Design a protein around this ligand. Structure first.
Ligand SMILES: [Cl-]
Ligand SMILES: [Cl-]
Ligand SMILES: [Zn+2]
Ligand SMILES: [Zn+2]
Lengths: 21, 30, 30, 21, 30, 21, 30, 21, 30, 21, 30, 21
């Protein structure tokens, strides 16, 4: 998931925004 | 914005800055 | 352990610490 | 909520566990 | 995204986040 | 400057990009 | 609480949250 | 010691509490 | 270098920075 | 103590070394 | 002071503490 | 540069001071 993707590869702030309430 | 390489607590800091007053959920795998 | 004021990014750092793999929600609007 | 309990007031590490999944 | 108060080390953490590889300047005197 | 815009007042992530190189 | 994987400054942050007003000592090896 | 254990392996908050004053 | 207000977790982050391998004590009661 | 010297008042990085072991 | 091993955001925190009100520039390679 | 040196090897606060404005 996002937690693993950001750490093992890379991720964008736009991808992160999907986890906001 | 630039792409991010974020592990551990640094991911939670980034979510905090991105989401602000909306808050967020932190859901790691298993 | 103790009781303290935990605000903003420091609050979410503490949640990460305490919850870890379980994950958590940060929902300031409530 | 969490801000009122832990920032405005004070809370323990045990109280913080209330917000784990 | 959102608008929030970002001060001190938290401000520079946010700049790092947003700028990354591009680099940034933090010039509080202005 | 940045402190007035982002600490004293409030600023967006987009505004913060003003200070990238 | 969950078990922790903490390096560098992240250990000091955890000690700070655990000990609160009691404070703590940070004593790395050699 | 605790500083090395938490980083090379894992450690609990209960183990950390032993380093409070 | 400079003189600034360093409080809470930020104070202990600065001690870690300055002391490193020597270790340090954080004893707010005094 | 350290809080009075460095948080309440202000202190230098050199002053912070007073609290190293 | 001791020598430092600083990656990612931890470098920016160290620059913040070292430079204070002078501010600083963060310029990574490529 | 300094960003790479501090991460791949080590660096001093004195080296860091060169990046202040
Ligand atoms: Cl603060
Ligand atoms: Cl890290
Ligand atoms: Zn803070
Ligand atoms: Zn880190």
């Amino acid at each position: 998931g996002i937690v693993e993707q950001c750490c093992t590869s890379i991720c964008s702030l736009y991808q992160l925004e999907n986890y906001c309430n | 914005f630039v792409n991010q390489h974020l592990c551990g607590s640094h991911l939670v800091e980034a979510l905090y800055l991105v989401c602000g007053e909306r808050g967020f959920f932190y859901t790691p795998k298993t």
